[PDB]
Amino acid sequence: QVQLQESGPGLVKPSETLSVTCSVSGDSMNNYYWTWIRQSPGKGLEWIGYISDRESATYNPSLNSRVVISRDTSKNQLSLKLNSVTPADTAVYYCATARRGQRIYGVVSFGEFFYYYSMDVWGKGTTVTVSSASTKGPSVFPLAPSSKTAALGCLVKDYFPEPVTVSWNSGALTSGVHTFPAVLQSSGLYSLSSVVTVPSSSLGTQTYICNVNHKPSNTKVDKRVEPKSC
Amino acid sequence: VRPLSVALGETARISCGRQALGSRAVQWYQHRPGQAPILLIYNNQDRPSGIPERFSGTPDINFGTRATLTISGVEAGDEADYYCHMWDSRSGFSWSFGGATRLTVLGQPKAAPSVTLFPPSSEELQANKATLVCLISDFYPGAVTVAWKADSSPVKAGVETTTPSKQSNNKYAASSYLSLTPEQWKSHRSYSCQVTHEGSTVEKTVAPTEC
Amino acid sequence: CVTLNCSNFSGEIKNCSFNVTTGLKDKKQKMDALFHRRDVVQINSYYMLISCNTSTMAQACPKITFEPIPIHYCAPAGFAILKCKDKGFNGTGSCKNVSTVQCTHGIKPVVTTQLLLNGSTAEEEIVIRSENITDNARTIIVQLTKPININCTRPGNNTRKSVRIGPGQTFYATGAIIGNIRQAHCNVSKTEWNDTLRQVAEQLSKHFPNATTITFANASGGDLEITTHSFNCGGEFFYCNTSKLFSSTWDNSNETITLQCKIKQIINMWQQVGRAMYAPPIQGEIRCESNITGLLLTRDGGANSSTN
Amino acid sequence: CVTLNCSNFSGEIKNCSFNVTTGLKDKKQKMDALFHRRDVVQINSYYMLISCNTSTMAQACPKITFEPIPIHYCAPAGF
Numbered sequence: 001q002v003q004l005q006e007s008g009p010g011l012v013k014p015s016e017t018l019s020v021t022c023s024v025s026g027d028s029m030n031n032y033y034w035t036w037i038r039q040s041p042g043k044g045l046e047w048i049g050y051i052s053d054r055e056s057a058t059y060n061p062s063l064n065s066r067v068v069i070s071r072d073t074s075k076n077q078l079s080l081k082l083n084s085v086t087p088a089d090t091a092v093y094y095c096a097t098a099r100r101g102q103r104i105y106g107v108v109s110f111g112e113f114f115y116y117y118s119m120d121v122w123g124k125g126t127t128v129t130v131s132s133a134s135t136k137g138p139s140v141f142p143l144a145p146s147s148k149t150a151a152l153g154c155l156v157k158d159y160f161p162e163p164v165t166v167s168w169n170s171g172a173l174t175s176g177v178h179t180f181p182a183v184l185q186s187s188g189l190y191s192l193s194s195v196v197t198v199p200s201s202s203l204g205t206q207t208y209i210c211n212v213n214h215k216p217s218n219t220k221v222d223k224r225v226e227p228k229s230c
Numbered sequence: 231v232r233p234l235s236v237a238l239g240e241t242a243r244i245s246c247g248r249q250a251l252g253s254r255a256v257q258w259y260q261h262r263p264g265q266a267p268i269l270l271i272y273n274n275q276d277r278p279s280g281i282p283e284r285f286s287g288t289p290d291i292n293f294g295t296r297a298t299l300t301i302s303g304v305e306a307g308d309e310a311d312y313y314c315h316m317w318d319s320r321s322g323f324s325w326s327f328g329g330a331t332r333l334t335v336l337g338q339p340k341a342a343p344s345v346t347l348f349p350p351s352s353e354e355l356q357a358n359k360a361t362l363v364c365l366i367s368d369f370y371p372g373a374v375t376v377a378w379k380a381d382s383s384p385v386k387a388g389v390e391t392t393t394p395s396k397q398s399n400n401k402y403a404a405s406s407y408l409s410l411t412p413e414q415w416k417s418h419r420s421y422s423c424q425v426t427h428e429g430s431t432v433e434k435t436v437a438p439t440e441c
Numbered sequence: 442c443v444t445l446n447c448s449n450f451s452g453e454i455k456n457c458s459f460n461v462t463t464g465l466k467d468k469k470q471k472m473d474a475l476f477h478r479r480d481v482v483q484i485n486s487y488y489m490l491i492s493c494n495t496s497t498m499a500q501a502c503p504k505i506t507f508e509p510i511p512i513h514y515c516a517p518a519g520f521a522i523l524k525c526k527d528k529g530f531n532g533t534g535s536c537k538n539v540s541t542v543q544c545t546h547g548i549k550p551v552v553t554t555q556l557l558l559n560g561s562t563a564e565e566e567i568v569i570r571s572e573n574i575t576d577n578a579r580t581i582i583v584q585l586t587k588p589i590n591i592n593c594t595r596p597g598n599n600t601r602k603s604v605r606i607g608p609g610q611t612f613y614a615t616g617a618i619i620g621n622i623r624q625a626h627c628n629v630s631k632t633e634w635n636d637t638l639r640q641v642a643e644q645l646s647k648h649f650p651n652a653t654t655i656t657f658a659n660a661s662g663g664d665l666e667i668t669t670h671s672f673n674c675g676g677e678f679f680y681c682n683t684s685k686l687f688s689s690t691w692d693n694s695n696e697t698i699t700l701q702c703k704i705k706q707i708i709n710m711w712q713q714v715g716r717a718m719y720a721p722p723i724q725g726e727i728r729c730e731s732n733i734t735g736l737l738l739t740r741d742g743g744a745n746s747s748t749n
Numbered sequence: 750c751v752t753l754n755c756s757n758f759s760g761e762i763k764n765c766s767f768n769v770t771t772g773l774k775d776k777k778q779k780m781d782a783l784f785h786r787r788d789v790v791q792i793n794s795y796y797m798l799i800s801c802n803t804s805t806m807a808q809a810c811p812k813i814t815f816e817p818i819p820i821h822y823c824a825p826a827g828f
């Protein structure tokens with residue numbers, strides 16, 4: 001039950017240190033290798049570097065020796081450090097396991113074999129943005145259901161930056177949930193929406209509460225959605 | 231990025247960018263936008279647990295063949311970006327994943343869009359703000375023109391429209407945002423969200439004078 | 442014979458750069474090539490082909506092969522070839538079973554050192570023939586009765602490049618190889634080798650005390666042909682580290698072994714100072730197989746007698 | 750097989766200029782000559798004899814003639 005969890009600040013100033021943490025769950029960190037992969041918008045996913053079981057990290061040479069990958073044994077976490085970051089470092093960060101395969105074609109005595117690495121297990125992935133702009137908390141407004149199957153939702157207005165995790169009843173209702181993507185207004189702030197399909201008889205009996213969490217703003221909002229007074 | 235368009239049910243073969251140089255061990259990766267990348271084929275043709283048998287690789291019979299990912303029975307869920315990771319002895323350590331191959335599935339059955347216009351909430355009106363949310367879900371193809379209308383005249387000011395995006399049902403989903411002031415929301419008789427899809431038009435209307 | 446500004450290939454083999462002549466004389470040719478370490482020596486560092494200060498180097502035509510072909514040496518009328526059909530035949534002396542023929546049988550000119558390949562096969566017991574056993578200076582030659590299956594391979598997928606240092610003077614060199622960077626080697630079945638070596642120790646004890654010891658060691662000193670196994674294999678000349686074969690000790694009473702082999706393109710066999718030959722490259726991976734039938738052994742000589 | 754800085758003769762035939770070798774080796778020979786168009790090709794423009802990149806060129810002695818002479822092929826006794 002190996003689960004990788006990406007955790008980061010999501011917003012760092014240029015020419016500073018970027019810290020990302022990858023959490024290992026259902027296994028130890030001394031059996032397989034670990035690697036970091038980022039995906040910048042407009043470009044493909046990029047291989048950053050890996051760390052072996054002997055605590056000897058290897059990085060991609062096209063980073064000018066600015067990346068540092070470390071791992072802890074008591075807490076089972078994989079750290080990522082990047083110094084002198086630039087706004088081009090804005091990318092979705094993925095941490096995945098590195099599986100060492102050995103392709104053998106001839107006699108092993110002469111080293112007639114080359115190792116190849118494949119990433120079997122990946123993480124969900126966190127979004128990190130590098131910019132000098134400040135942060136801005138979201139505004140959660142409960143979209144009341146119409147009186148006339150009914151539909152209700154919650155409106156998350158302007159915030160910065162992405163992403164925003166939205167759940168319903170702390171994860172107790174998953175059917176009919178449709179979280180629409182946010183819009184990029186001319187002011188430079190995102191605003192998304194999230195609705196859920198529930199029967200009309202549930203109105204007046206169920207306590208529907210949408211949960212909004214924004215990690216860069218360190219704000220978790222719980223809003224109780226109730227119909228209008230008419 | 232290299233484009234590719236394949237119909238439904240036909241056996242497609244995604245070609246590889248770079249070629250082999252000696253004994254090779256090819257890895258084919260499937261990446262969905264916003265989700266975790268998942269490799270389909272590792273080491274020529276070896277298939278990990280969970281991958282269906284519709285995907286296949288190229289045998290390493292000492293050169294003579296090109297590493298190709300054969301996909302039989304291409305359905306709607308195969309639309310993604312595919313990378314070819316070549317591992318040969320001559321090239322040594324391969325860091326780049328090759329040129330991206332964006333696979334697009336054509337001939338999908340169209341679906342009528344489900345439009346739902348939501349008025350600004352009462353708590354948002356207390357914040358001296360207003361926003362009209364018009365959501366469009368489940369529609370194909372991904373070509374929808376959104377036009378906001380105040381009463382009978384269209385409004386081009388304060389219109390924030392999103393690009394239609396695919397969701398889990400292989401149908402597109404779009405959302406439109408109309409930023410207004412509380413006085414402008416309570417002044418007009420009724421607001422309407424006009425959605426045009428494949429010539430057809432579905433319109434939702436909300437009014438402040440109706441519960 | 443130009444200055445070769447060689448770079449270490451991506452160590453034997455070197456990637457060199459040099460200036461030659463084109464079809465024109467004043468127009469010079471800036472080209473590259475690939476050779477082995479035993480082909481050039483330094484004077485980054487600059488290199489020169491080894492035989493450029495000793496014997497005249499001359500490339501052989503790519504049409505004439507070096508594969509041995511059986512030869513039946515004959516004799517005209519008035520002369521006859523006598524064949525001794527004795528199975529247990531010591532090299533010289535009387536022969537009870539003599540036959541006459543006008544020509545010999547199939548004899549391949551196997552240009553090889555130490556290990557004799559594709560030779561004749563003795564009958565019954567492995568025949569031991571030496572001009573003088575008690576003289577270590579005399580080279581002892583053996584003839585087996587069971588042919589083995591030895592396999593030498595150059596797993597380098599080489600390529601042949603054609604430059605024009607003409608007019609008419611075309612030169613074929615080695616370009617960027619394909620496949621893998623795999624050095625030359627040979628294979629020997631350890632079971633049959635150990636089985637054959639035991640029969641040798643049982644035959645060597647016929648010219649020595651009954652209860653004695655037979656020791657095997659690698660080559661002492663001399664040229665690389667005297668130390669390594671020289672032989673041909675599809676055009677290229679192979680020289681193998683035979684140290685793993687000769688390192689055993691035998692008293693009175695299923696894997697395979699590999700030998701590191703080297704390849705040389707500039708040959709100076711028979712030690713003829715003044716003339717030389719270059720081996721043209723051979724395309725594709727080379728694989729040769731043969732039957733080892735004889736061996737050229739040599740004692741160490743001066744020591745306490747009948748000890749070891 | 751030298752670079753032939755040829756000029757159009759006063760068109761087939763070309764009046765060329767080139768550098769060869771004298772009786773000495775370091776002492777080079779600045780000389781001229783005249784050939785046909787099918788003898789050299791370009792690489793003013795510079796020319797080179799056509800066969801300098803294919804087959805070894807070798808001048809025949811000016812003493813051996815090429816005039817045909819009748820030959821009476823025979824056969825020995827028994828044939």
Ligand SMILES: *[C@@H]1O[C@H](CO)[C@@H](O[C@@H]2O[C@H](CO)[C@@H](O[C@@H]3O[C@H](CO[C@H]4O[C@H](CO[C@H]5O[C@H](CO)[C@@H](O)[C@H](O)[C@@H]5O[C@H]5O[C@H](CO)[C@@H](O)[C@H](O)[C@@H]5O)[C@@H](O)[C@H](O[C@H]5O[C@H](CO)[C@@H](O)[C@H](O)[C@@H]5O)[C@@H]4O)[C@@H](O)[C@H](O[C@H]4O[C@H](CO)[C@@H](O)[C@H](O)[C@@H]4O[C@H]4O[C@H](CO)[C@@H](O)[C@H](O)[C@@H]4O[C@H]4O[C@H](CO)[C@@H](O)[C@H](O)[C@@H]4O)[C@@H]3O)[C@H](O)[C@H]2NC(C)=O)[C@H](O)[C@H]1NC(C)=O
Nearest residue numbers: 101102104105106107108253273274275290291292592628
């Ligand atoms: C002189 O002496 C020399 C020294 O002795 C001698 O050198 C030897 O040369 C031969 C070739 O002539 C070499 O043979 C090669 O061996 C390679 C390795 O083979 C072993 O490993 C594989 C992989 O098995 C995995 O699983 C087992 C357990 O199930 C593990 O124990 C393994 O470690 C391995 O584990 C994997 O996963 C690990 C964890 O991630 C990794 O760490 C690890 O690296 C692995 O990735 C086995 O399949 C092999 O079994 C074979 O051999 C046994 C006998 O030992 C047979 O009984 C059996 O039937 C098999 O034939 C063995 O255990 C081989 O990979 C290699 O074969 C590939 O390469 C050749 C050449 O490039 C290709 O042409 C060929 O097509 C092969 O490619 C297929 O197989 C590989 C296997 O990994 C796949 O990766 C590849 O994609 C492809 O598979 C696909 O195609 C197949 C059909 O083509 C299909 O069936 C598959 O399903 C798939 O679709 C080759 O056989 C040998 O290594 C040299 N050295 C020695 C010591 O022998 C020299 O030859 C001598 N000279 C002469 C003239 O004799």
Ligand SMILES: *[C@@H]1O[C@H](CO)[C@@H](O[C@@H]2O[C@H](CO)[C@@H](O[C@@H]3O[C@H](CO[C@H]4O[C@H](CO[C@H]5O[C@H](CO)[C@@H](O)[C@H](O)[C@@H]5O)[C@@H](O)[C@H](O)[C@@H]4O)[C@@H](O)[C@H](O[C@H]4O[C@H](CO)[C@@H](O)[C@H](O)[C@@H]4O)[C@@H]3O)[C@H](O)[C@H]2NC(C)=O)[C@H](O)[C@H]1NC(C)=O
Nearest residue numbers: 508509551553558559672673674675676728729730731732
């Ligand atoms: C001790 O003895 C053993 C055995 O006698 C020796 O082993 C010999 O080694 C030499 C190399 O040193 C080999 O020579 C090579 O032979 C190759 C194979 O020759 C045959 O096949 C060629 C290709 O034909 C293939 O395809 C057809 C159709 O699919 C098949 O029917 C066929 O069986 C083959 O699979 C033919 O072209 C060729 O005529 C033979 O029929 C050759 O590939 C190789 O060179 C080829 O190409 C050259 C480039 O044009 C050309 O000049 C050659 O003439 C030839 O065509 C080369 O000749 C021997 O084959 C090999 N066996 C034997 C029986 O001789 C061992 O070397 C020896 N030990 C020592 C130290 O000498």
Ligand SMILES: *[C@@H]1O[C@H](CO)[C@@H](O)[C@H](O)[C@H]1NC(C)=O
Nearest residue numbers: 444446447448458485486487
């Ligand atoms: C030889 O090669 C090295 C490496 O490229 C270069 O620095 C040097 O100038 C070269 N020398 C000559 C004489 O070509």
Ligand SMILES: *[C@@H]1O[C@H](CO)[C@@H](O)[C@H](O)[C@H]1NC(C)=O
Nearest residue numbers: 444445446458459460469471
């Ligand atoms: C060949 O000659 C040119 C100029 O004559 C020189 O620049 C180059 O370095 C030479 N090459 C080598 C390998 O010395």
Ligand SMILES: *[C@@H]1O[C@H](CO)[C@@H](O)[C@H](O)[C@H]1NC(C)=O
Nearest residue numbers: 482483484491492493494495
């Ligand atoms: C040629 O040069 C090599 C190395 O510089 C040297 O070993 C050899 O003795 C030389 N040849 C002669 C005939 O001296």
Ligand SMILES: *[C@@H]1O[C@H](CO)[C@@H](O)[C@H](O)[C@H]1NC(C)=O
Nearest residue numbers: 526527528529530536537538
């Ligand atoms: C000679 O041949 C005969 C039979 O052909 C055989 O009996 C005899 O042993 C042979 N001689 C030797 C020395 O082997």
Ligand SMILES: *[C@@H]1O[C@H](CO)[C@@H](O)[C@H](O)[C@H]1NC(C)=O
Nearest residue numbers: 531532533534535571572573
């Ligand atoms: C071989 O043995 C015979 C008799 O045993 C002897 O006459 C002959 O000289 C021996 N040959 C050699 C080379 O020792």
Ligand SMILES: *[C@@H]1O[C@H](CO)[C@@H](O)[C@H](O)[C@H]1NC(C)=O
Nearest residue numbers: 572573574575576577578579
């Ligand atoms: C062999 O040489 C030794 C000298 O080392 C000599 O004593 C002996 O007689 C020689 N054997 C023969 C058969 O001549």
Ligand SMILES: *[C@@H]1O[C@H](CO)[C@@H](O)[C@H](O)[C@H]1NC(C)=O
Nearest residue numbers: 451456457458473616617618
């Ligand atoms: C060898 O040197 C040449 C010089 O131009 C270069 O082009 C080539 O890439 C190098 N490597 C190989 C394998 O040829």
Ligand SMILES: *[C@@H]1O[C@H](CO)[C@@H](O)[C@H](O)[C@H]1NC(C)=O
Nearest residue numbers: 590591592628629630697730
């Ligand atoms: C040599 O190769 C042949 C053909 O594959 C095989 O039959 C034989 O056993 C091999 N011998 C060794 C020692 O590898």
Ligand SMILES: *[C@@H]1O[C@H](CO)[C@@H](O)[C@H](O)[C@H]1NC(C)=O
Nearest residue numbers: 632634635636637639690691
């Ligand atoms: C292999 O060599 C050992 C060491 O002399 C010997 O004891 C054994 O009998 C040999 N086995 C074979 C099959 O020759």
Ligand SMILES: *[C@@H]1O[C@H](CO)[C@@H](O)[C@H](O)[C@H]1NC(C)=O
Nearest residue numbers: 658659660661668682684688
């Ligand atoms: C022979 O073996 C010894 C050690 O066993 C080693 O020092 C020596 O270099 C070897 N000789 C050759 C020519 O490989």
Ligand SMILES: *[C@@H]1O[C@H](CO)[C@@H](O)[C@H](O)[C@H]1NC(C)=O
Nearest residue numbers: 659669681682683684685701
């Ligand atoms: C040959 O092999 C032996 C042991 O395997 C080693 O000591 C020796 O150095 C090798 N010789 C060469 C020339 O590689």
Ligand SMILES: *[C@@H]1O[C@H](CO)[C@@H](O)[C@H](O)[C@H]1NC(C)=O
Nearest residue numbers: 292293294598619620725726
């Ligand atoms: C050598 O390389 C060529 C070109 O890729 C290939 O066609 C051929 O099969 C290769 N041969 C070997 C023995 O690897």
Ligand SMILES: *[C@@H]1O[C@H](CO)[C@@H](O)[C@H](O)[C@H]1NC(C)=O
Nearest residue numbers: 559587588589590730731732
């Ligand atoms: C090697 O021996 C085997 C079996 O004795 C035979 O079939 C094969 O033809 C022999 N090879 C040569 C080159 O004589």
Ligand SMILES: *[C@@H]1O[C@H](CO)[C@@H](O)[C@H](O)[C@H]1NC(C)=O
Nearest residue numbers: 752754755756766793794795
């Ligand atoms: C070739 O001849 C032309 C005409 O006289 C002259 O201008 C040019 O400099 C000459 N070039 C050489 C290399 O001699």
